[PDB]
Design a binder for this molecule. Sequence first.
Ligand SMILES: NCc1ccc(C(F)(F)F)cc1
Ligand SMILES: NCc1ccc(C(F)(F)F)cc1
Length: 330
Amino acid sequence: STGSATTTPIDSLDDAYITPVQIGTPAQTLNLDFDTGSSDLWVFSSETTASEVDGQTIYTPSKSTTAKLLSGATWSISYGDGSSSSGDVYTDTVSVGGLTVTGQAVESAKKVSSSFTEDSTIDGLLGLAFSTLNTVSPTQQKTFFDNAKASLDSPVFTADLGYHAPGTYNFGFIDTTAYTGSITYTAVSTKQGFWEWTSTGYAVGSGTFKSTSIDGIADTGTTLLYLPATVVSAYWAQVSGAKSSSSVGGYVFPCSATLPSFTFGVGSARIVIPGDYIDFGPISTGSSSCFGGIQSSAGIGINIFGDVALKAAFVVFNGATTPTLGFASK
Ligand SMILES: NCc1ccc(C(F)(F)F)cc1
Ligand SMILES: NCc1ccc(C(F)(F)F)cc1
């Protein structure tokens, strides 16, 4: 079987993408952030502290005839940005675009950090990294993808994120009408639990392609592109007036400038990120300084191919026994 769902940017900057997901019987529809950088399906719920909820749709297990409390199980997660949440665990039926999984672990948030409370458009996360990163204790739980793998026609899902426009998450099949040319596949290391791969190099604008290995993760749950300091310096050196700002915490540039494109290598193929994709607008309302979509990974410890890069391509997450990542222009 297969599944297909539309994903929609939450704001005018493509800061995140939400996808409707049906939980429980009868269905309770929540808009979740599909995150290939984590492995927990957690939701705002009727158990979440009342002061920590500001407009989100909540999951109510007491109204679901298929929800079962997973006795003794707890979860606690901390994200690379300092976000955090925790609670208990239910099992319930979960459907994504027609694709249904029974007995999926649904982690009910009892406490959420402020960054989640202030985001009224995101009702929770659906993790799509490898199940070894799941935080449920004492019994680790499988992701939605891992539980659906056996029933899928093909053990793959694809991300087709839009630039200021809706996109598509497909489960179980590859839409050959959604990309141009061929798909270039590259090896994935699962040793850290991520969709970790190695890019073959980069180029800035119309400049020479620099062949160099960049190890990083494909993360739909991260907004920006985080690359080594040498690469990021070479990019912003081509933008007049650009500078790294300690008070802002990243590279900023004059909003009147035009940004060059950024190319990254996938094997022998090249994915081109248009310069417009790197513009994330004024650092504050009315400011003439704009925030850059390519930032240094030095403070993070790992390079992250976030939405800025991924939305420039059709991306195949091949969860075969030897997992691979496929990239294609679109
Ligand atoms: N999108 C989930 C995520 C967030 C942060 C990280 C970090 F910081 F650990 F790399 C990995 C995955
Ligand atoms: N990378 C996972 C993630 C996704 C969204 C958020 C936000 F936007 F809610 F802060 C935090 C962490």
